[PDB]
Design a protein around this ligand. Structure first.
Ligand SMILES: C=C(C)[C@]12C[C@@H](C)[C@@]34O[C@](Cc5ccccc5)(O[C@@H]1[C@@H]3C=C(COC(=O)Cc1ccc(O)c(OC)c1)C[C@]1(O)C(=O)C(C)=C[C@@H]41)O2
Lengths: 595, 92, 72, 131
């Protein structure tokens, strides 16, 4: 009986289970039959046995497997999986790995367990609450729970060798899962990097031909890119500055070109970081990243040196469009002054069509990236807005209300000149601080005043039918421009008091408070915005800026495990250390320091 | 010394901002009524207080006053952040 | 914490209801059996669940758990 | 440290010597059990210790917290709410909300069997708020 059977396996008494094989021979049923399974979330007696281990072992398992083998069960006991949408595909082997028993794992593999069996339930998904995500395969589970011996065993077993190439429903492999579990704590960081390195060495030993970093998931992301995407800092840092003293030095990325006294020159590989390639790491930190610590990633050495080089090459092109846009605003200020005006106005309509086509190409090309970008895409929004306003004002001036849109577009153009303050350090700091603040807190202050202003305007309108003229009289009163009497006067004073000594006051304090939270991290945001600029510029105008150069120099660094030499593109950076004589000299590749 | 330091920090930038917006509002009032020079002098003495249609004039006043509040708050928090970032021992 | 406190104030007031009462309010949690006392009669209590994530668990081994498998 | 050690020792001794009686149930003339009383005056550390108790003793029935199951870094803890639920008359939550006179009530709010319960009830009643 099933309750009897569960008490047997939880007891773990083999002789108590004796005769059950003859009971099955007489009964002529199967252990996979639903009678001996629970109904909802259908698990088995075997899983209940594996959950209940007496000091690391359980005696009934091999006789139970022998009983099922002698039973003529077509589908064996071991490979059977659960059923529930909460819990699907879970196995005995997953449990045995979680309960940290090499012996049971060896037993299951010795009795024909599956190794590719993967668990796709709702519990095994990252988005939920109180749930555990590791990828889906058993080898991934062994990796995530720092059991090196089980990993060595599952790779080195005779029967069913595990495949690092294998990937789950989302196409994530082992390295992807190690990325997904990474957080900021120190123990997690050390465990992940040690596991990652050991796995790369083992994958070198077993599948030398395959480049394990090369495999993307369904989203087309390699593990470096996925490491970038989720704001995973520490593993990303370690993947860039990665050096192996092993025989398999080719896996590494950093190299020392020559060393001479305190001066040495480091080489970094740059194959994924190049802005030339589609889905560069820079484009993914910039656009697709939703991370709060996206500023923190930029400080790292190859990124900083590369952005510094690109920006210093870029500065004249920045000054070029600075003067061009200033001259356009000058011409539009002139046409607004003279409204000789006709040909100027035709040129302004051309320029409005130009800015409209530019922002149209910007937002038309990327939409889901605009949904991701909306938290910080504040500039190109204002550019598209000024272009639309100028288009409407020119079209209506070609045909009575065009002058409000015209003066709005003029004011917004001469304030959109503020975009080009980002070139210099401190001006970019002030402008980026202002833009990030005004997104965060100014919208709250705007909503509060309007309700009280509408109330006081309708109040004066009922007290002393156009709501507009009521707001006119109210704001003329509050700004001080123009004008029971005593009670009304008292209310106005109270209304005026609240208007300035509350909203403005509290909001300013909040902003000051907000600044402290964002304090001591501004330089990083400043360095970041220049990346956006250079990438855009790299993108070019409606007249394109295609055929951008590579970033590095090509240098064949050593030999591959294959006989062919390995040409890579690399970016060289200098460094001066004075602690050098304590340390031993690194392995070098270039002898003569020249060039 | 602090006055000259803060002037060197903020004055040129804020003056370029205010000059850009002032030429914008000036050419705007020039189109609304007087060329950009005369409208510039008139607008500059208008904001100082020396000295359908009312809706447009009040909308210009609302836009200018709240935008000037935005720039004044910006210069305030910029001076505060610079001072909080400033070294205060080395003035001696 | 102040925001949590204000939400607590509000949820207690809304559970009190309008001029019409919010009566027959549902008892929270689920009734279970925790065990038996030193008295031979069993313990039966109402209960509430919570989740936690802790990475020091390899340093300090697991405690006793009545429920074998993750249930609902 | 004094209070928690002495309190636990007294509970064990009262379990040993008067087993039928539940000591923490007895109210005062103002009618408060010690959990409610510790809430009402805003004493924090003893309160935190009283909510989440464990006993590896043969008598674990004294303890409130349990573990449903554990799996990797995930573990699922039970709590009792035998005095904490707002269903009951003169609950802990009503005492923290209204009857208290302490400054530091907000720190008493952010505790685990309180926090998950408040989140559950709040998300249960979002639509009536919008209504
Ligand atoms: C919320 C938005 C989008 C906004 C739309 C208009 C109404 C705007 O007033 C604000 C708030 C406001 C409302 C009423 C009076 C003053 C200010 O700020 C901008 C918006 C704010 C100004 C000032 O310009 C800026 O925002 C600075 C800036 C320029 C270029 C950028 O690339 C940028 O991003 C970094 C920021 C321009 C106006 O369009 C303008 O000149 C007129 C007609 C009013 C300005 O509203």
């Amino acid at each position: 009986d099933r309750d009897r059977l569960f008490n047997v396996v939880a007891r773990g008494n083999p002789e108590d289970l004796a005769g059950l094989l003859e009971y099955l021979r007489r009964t002529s049923k199967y252990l996979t039959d639903s009678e001996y399974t629970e109904g909802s979330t259908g698990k088995t007696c075997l899983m209940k046995a594996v959950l209940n281990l007496q000091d690391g072992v359980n005696a009934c398992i091999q006789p139970l497997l022998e009983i099922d083998r002698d039973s003529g069960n077509p589908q064996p006991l071991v490979n059977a999986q659960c059923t529930d949408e909460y819990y699907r595909g879970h196995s005995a082997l997953h449990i045995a790995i979680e309960k940290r028993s090499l012996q049971c794992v060896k037993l299951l593999v010795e009795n024909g367990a599956n190794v590719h069996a993967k668990a796709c339930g709702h519990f095994f998904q990252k988005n939920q609450d109180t749930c555990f995500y590791f990828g889906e395969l058993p080898l991934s589970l062994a990796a995530c729970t720092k059991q090196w011996d089980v990993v060595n065993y599952l790779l080195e077993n005779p029967h069913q060798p595990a495949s690092l190439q294998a990937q789950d429903s989302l196409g994530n492999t082992v390295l992807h899962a190690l990325v997904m579990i990474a957080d900021d704590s120190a123990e997690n960081s050390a465990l992940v990097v040690r596991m990652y390195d050991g796995l790369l060495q083992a994958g070198a030993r077993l599948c030398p031909n395959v480049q394990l970093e090369g495999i993307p998931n369904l989203e087309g992301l390699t593990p470096l890119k996925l490491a970038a995407k989720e704001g995973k800092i520490e593993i990303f840092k370690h993947i860039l500055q990665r050096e192996f003293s092993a025989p398999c030095q080719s896996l590494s990325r950093k190299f020392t070109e020559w060393c001479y006294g305190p001066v040495r020159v480091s080489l970094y590989d740059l194959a994924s970081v190049d802005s030339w390639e589609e889905n560069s790491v820079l484009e993914i930190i910039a656009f697709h990243s939703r991370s709060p610590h996206r500023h923190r990633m930029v400080v790292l050495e190859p990124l900083n040196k590369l952005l510094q080089a690109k920006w210093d090459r870029l500065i004249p092109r920045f000054c070029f469009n600075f003067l061009c846009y200033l001259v356009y605003m000058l011409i539009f200020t002139a046409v607004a002054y003279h409204q000789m005006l006709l040909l100027g106005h035709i040129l302004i309509l051309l320029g409005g069509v130009y800015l409209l086509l530019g922002q149209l190409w910007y937002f038309w090309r990327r939409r889901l990236f605009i949904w991701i970008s909306f938290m910080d895409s504040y500039s190109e929004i204002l550019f598209l807005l000024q272009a639309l306003l100028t288009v409407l004002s020119q079209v209506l001036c070609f045909l009575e209300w065009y002058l409000p849109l015209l003066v709005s577009s003029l004011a917004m153009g001469w304030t959109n000149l503020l975009y080009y303050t980002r070139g210099f350090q401190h001006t970019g700091i002030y402008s980026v601080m202002i833009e990030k603040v005004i997104l965060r807190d100014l919208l709250r202050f705007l909503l509060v005043y309007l309700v009280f202003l509408f109330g006081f305007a309708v109040a004066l309108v009922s007290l002393s039918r156009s709501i507009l003229d009521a707001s006119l009289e109210l704001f003329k009163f509050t700004i001080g421009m123009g004008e029971f009497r005593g009670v009304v006067l008292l209310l106005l004073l109270a209304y005026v008091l609240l208007t300035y000594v509350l909203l403005l006051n509290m909001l300013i304090a909040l902003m000051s408070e907000t600044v402290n939270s964002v304090a001591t991290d501004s330089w990083s945001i400043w360095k970041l915005q220049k990346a956006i600029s250079v990438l855009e510029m790299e993108n070019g105008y409606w007249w394109c800026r295609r055929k951008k150069q590579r970033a590095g120099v090509m240098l064949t660094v050593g030999t591959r495990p294959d006989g062919s030499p390995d040409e890579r593109w690399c970016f060289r950076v200098g460094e001066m250390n004075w602690a050098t004589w304590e340390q031993t000299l690194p392995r070098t590749l270039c002898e003569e320091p020249s060039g | 010394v602090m006055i000259e330091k803060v002037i060197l920090r903020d004055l040129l930038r804020f003056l370029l901002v205010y000059l850009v917006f002032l030429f914008g509002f000036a050419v705007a009032l020039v189109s609304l009524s007087r060329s950009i020079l005369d409208a510039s002098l008139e607008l500059f003495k208008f904001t100082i207080g020396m000295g359908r249609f009312r809706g447009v004039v009040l909308l210009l006043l609302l836009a200018y006053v709240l935008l000037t509040y935005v720039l004044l708050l910006n210069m305030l928090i910029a001076l505060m952040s610079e001072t909080v970032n400033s070294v205060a021992t080395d003035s001696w």
